[PDB]
Structure 1
Amino acid sequence: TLRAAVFDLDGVLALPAVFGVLGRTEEALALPRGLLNDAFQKGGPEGATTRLMKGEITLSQWIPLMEENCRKCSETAKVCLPKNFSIKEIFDKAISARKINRPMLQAALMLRKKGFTTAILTNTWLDDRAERDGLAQLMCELKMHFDFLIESCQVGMVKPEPQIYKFLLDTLKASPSEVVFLDDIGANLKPARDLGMVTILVQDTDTALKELEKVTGIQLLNTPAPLPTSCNPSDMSHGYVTVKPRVRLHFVELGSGPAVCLCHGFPESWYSWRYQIPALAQAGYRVLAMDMKGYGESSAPPEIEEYCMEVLCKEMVTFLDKLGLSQAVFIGHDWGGMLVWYMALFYPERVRAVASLNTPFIPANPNMSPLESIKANPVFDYQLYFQEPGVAEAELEQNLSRTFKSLFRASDESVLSMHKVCEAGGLFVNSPEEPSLSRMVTEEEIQFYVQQFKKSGFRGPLNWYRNMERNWKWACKSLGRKILIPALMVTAEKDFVLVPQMSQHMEDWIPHLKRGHIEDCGHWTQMDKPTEVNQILIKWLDSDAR
């Protein structure tokens, strides 16, 4: 029975293959067929290319050796290479053109999801070209999805030498009959077959996957669209900044490029952005996913006033100061969404661009007390229930698993009434003791939230709702302003509290506002519709945040 799947890189996980460009170049330059492929393999195991693949020499050292082989081959074939003939130019273009073979990667991802050990085994080189970063990026993206990456230039062995296959088997800790090995080079398949491994000769991806599906008995073709890559908390870089003596802020950090600061809502975590973190970093951004004040590994002081918007915003500015960041793009959800609009209003110099999921920008009404305003809309009753210190803490802390399982549900799964929370005595009075697991979350994801909330509970988080008067007074100072920096408002069709219609007057305050809208999306936007969130954010970041 199979338990391991091994994939080649060139022509398998990445397309188009380089040997294809050797042929394509021959045809474009009208050179004899096979001339470049012949000069590339010249000397066989004793040749320049084998030395390169074994890591004896670098790619830049190899380039003139290939040029000499090309001259030798042309002399014998009684032809002339063109005037502007350049091996460097040919390989730069080929490497740059090679992209991840997305259906092959998805199949590798599905096999690993079903318990397979996966590896990439590749004949590759030590790339020291000025343009080497393109390939470093491709390898980085690919390698994260596999248990092992075995590179010929690191191990000093190449396919089709028998020892590299023995090295592979030892690395996998598997017998040959337990392995499926995919390669586009027939000669590189022979030793794996001779050892007793299941082998697939990859020409077109579709046929290769049909063979792979047949042999593993796992559906790989025609599958439902997969979710984006998520985060394993123990594999992330964890950052910590002291913003003031008693307050430290925790964040998770991934990628390079313009800083993108993600601000979660209530009662959440940096982990609420798990589906966005890998995608935004892959899109070319340095992601900083916060544990907002009162949450996770960030400090949670007990005082109400520590959670007013003015204090929270000041602390986020200090956070940027201590990291040496003059700006960040601020993306918020729920309470995080409210905070980011206020960052844009009070600290526009520090905000590269601003985006909110669900939370609209609504200016303070200077002619009405904030308590009066909240009372006017019945959907906001939960916010009145959250007022009295200790009441909501007791209900939410009673059974953490029940709390998160009852809260984190899709629009067509909610056990929460929301109407008359105070009158009914709580949010969960008509909710089961042992809620079913929502289709959005796994038990493991629920337990992460349970583990995080064991540290500080719900006091700090609830305090975000306990500064209505304080926030109203501060917000009133901004009434003559407009938000004129790049801005995006993302509405969720099925958020029954933060309804899309509530955002309708935003253009009055944010004339250049851009929008996104997610159909069949509830309150927990990032985990409800991660693919759609990623598409909207990446498109907006690339056009408006640079």
Structure 2
Amino acid sequence: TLRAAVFDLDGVLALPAVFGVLGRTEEALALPRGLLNDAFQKGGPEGATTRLMKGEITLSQWIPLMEENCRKCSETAKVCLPKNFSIKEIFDKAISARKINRPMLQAALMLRKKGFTTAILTNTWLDDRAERDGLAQLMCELKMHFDFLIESCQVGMVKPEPQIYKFLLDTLKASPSEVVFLDDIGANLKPARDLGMVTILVQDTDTALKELEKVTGIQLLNTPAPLPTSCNPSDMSHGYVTVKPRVRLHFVELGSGPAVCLCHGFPESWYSWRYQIPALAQAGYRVLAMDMKGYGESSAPPEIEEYCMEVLCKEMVTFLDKLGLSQAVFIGHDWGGMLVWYMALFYPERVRAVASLNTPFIPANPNMSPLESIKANPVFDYQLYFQEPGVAEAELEQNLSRTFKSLFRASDESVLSMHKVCEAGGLFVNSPEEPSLSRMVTEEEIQFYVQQFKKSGFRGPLNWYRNMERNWKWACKSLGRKILIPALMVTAEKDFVLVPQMSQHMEDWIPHLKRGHIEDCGHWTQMDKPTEVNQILIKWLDSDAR
């Protein structure tokens, strides 16, 4: 029956409420109880505050009017305002104080996940203060989770006037009894109730959500930890840079602040970072999530040598040059992780800091051809299978959905064994035709990978494995160097290809290396444990890249 949920902002989605601060201010300052609320509300529907809220005047213009109402109220109460009483002051403080009420936001998210239309309905103002950005960020973070954000000052109407409710209902394409509205001001709920809406008066958060659970039939309190926010491909800014005549790089870009270039592995996509991209932007970074060369919407030329590490690296430097970035933080996973260590070794002037998920840094052995080195380890047998051009492309392109559903599996989900793959004759020879769906991915997310890899197939991607000798000779040039820029190695307990123990000597070559470790995490680190990756990257970025 209910099909829409509407949340107030102040005191409902954001806490503390700012009425809360006027109360505290009178007390803290020993003024007559309610005096600041009297100035604030002075003149009711024609007073300064309603003009603010309807968008007629800005917040900076309203400030000196509140001053005057503050004076008039105190003269009529026969008291004085303190020396250096400051309205600007009180409001800035109140506004930077208010944060997102996480449990209310998560209830709004879940309700939207079960198909409610959701909105924010707020009396707010046109903010032209020097410090306006704080609230702009908060409004940005909140709004992306809702169907509509309706602000009094943008629509020229204010709660509790009945016209804003009619605007609300008309925006929601829903009738009043399909609607639940939560607000902390009962006056605000009166007109809503009159049209026949379910309303909930919000004091303490938990009782509100109890009423909201009871009325919607949906579990909202005590629910498990939800996943971080993901990305919808068609809502992203997509960028394209030509690095040389045949070769463009595509990337997805979100956020502002220091550039953070994310480099995915095999056989993956910018979309492998879907859980990190919104968190890192939200943490104050400019995220660039690449399609690496060979993939997705980046160019995939056929020739093997277009994918040696030397060339891949030079082209990532060109990518920075054309975008006008003197540096970026480079964060890589799997093959992208190998690339970022090489960026650190050959272009340290261009890398602000370097982090790898799963891929360790192990210096080339100048006394052993890499083919040799490969044979002395059963787990890398599958790389020999990748060598012969055409062979692995035929198996991996033969059925895309089966390819990704077989690869992308959590550590307890019957991961593909990477074992005597040549002897067996292929990677999938012992896996079902129709694998079940991993818990890590939806069927939609698999079909995004399928659709990406329909553009170029597996030739480019496989070519990354086909420059063993050439990469070896290049890496040998770097054997006298150490990596002395800020560096993070994140190991994944149950990645059985890139095992944590393989990273154990990195401090010999990266003396100030920092570390994280994710337990119970297989090879697909970003989507296996997105919450922990986010926390480890953001904490390292804030201390070492900022």
Work out the number of aligned pairs and report it. 546
Q: Deviations over 1:378-427 (max 9, x none)?
A: 10011111111001000000000000000000011125121100000011
CA distance in 1, matches of 2:110, 2:218: 8
Q: Deviations over 1:34-83 (max 9, x none)?
A: 00011000000010000000000000000010000000000010000001
CA distance in 1, matches of 2:202, 2:174: 23
8 A contact 1:415–1:430 mirrored in 2? no
8 A contact 1:177–1:197 mirrored in 2? yes
Q: Deviations over 1:433-480 (max 9, x none)?
A: 000000000000000000000000000000000000000000000000
Matched, 1:47 2:47: yes
CA distance in 1, matches of 2:146, 2:179: 15
Task: Determine helix, strand or coil for the equivalent of 2:289.
Answer: strand
Task: Calculate percent identity across the aligned residue pairs.
Answer: 100
Using structure 2 for the length normalisation, give the TM-score: 1.00
Aligned to 1:353: 353
Q: Deviations over 1:163-193 (max 9, x none)?
A: 0000000000000000000000000000010
8 A contact 1:200–1:208 mirrored in 2? yes
Aligned to 2:113: 113
Matched, 1:478 2:478: yes
Matched, 1:367 2:387: no
Matched, 1:505 2:539: no
**Dislocated runs of 4+, deviation >6 Å:** none
CA distance in 1, matches of 2:417, 2:441: 21
Q: Deviations over 1:328-373 (max 9, x none)?
A: 0000000000000000000000000000000000100000000000
CA distance in 1, matches of 2:101, 2:28: 25
CA distance in 1, matches of 2:511, 2:114: 49
Q: Deviations over 1:311-339 (max 9, x none)?
A: 00000000000000000000000000000
Task: Determine helix, strand or coil for the equivalent of 2:250.
Answer: strand
8 A contact 1:415–1:431 mirrored in 2? no
Distance 1:499 1:415, change over 3 A: closer
Deviation at 1:14, TM superposition (A): 0.2
Task: Determine helix, strand or coil for the equivalent of 1:30.
Answer: coil
- What are the ranges of 5 or more consecutive residues in structure 2 without an aligned counterpart? none
8 A contact 1:239–1:251 mirrored in 2? yes
Aligned to 1:441: 441
Aligned to 1:488: 488
Deviation at 1:91, TM superposition (A): 0.3
CA distance in 1, matches of 2:209, 2:176: 20
CA distance in 1, matches of 2:127, 2:197: 31
8 A contact 1:260–1:328 mirrored in 2? yes
CA distance in 1, matches of 2:493, 2:414: 15
Deviation at 1:144, TM superposition (A): 0.3
CA distance in 2, matches of 1:443, 1:381: 30
Using structure 1 for the length normalisation, give the TM-score: 1.00
C-alpha RMSD over aligned residues: 0.4
CA distance in 2, matches of 1:381, 1:116: 50
8 A contact 1:396–1:403 mirrored in 2? yes
8 A contact 1:152–1:158 mirrored in 2? yes
CA distance in 1, matches of 2:542, 2:276: 15
CA distance in 2, matches of 1:224, 1:18: 30
Q: Deviations over 1:148-169 (max 9, x none)?
A: 0000001100000000000000
CA distance in 2, matches of 1:374, 1:512: 29
CA distance in 1, matches of 2:357, 2:60: 48
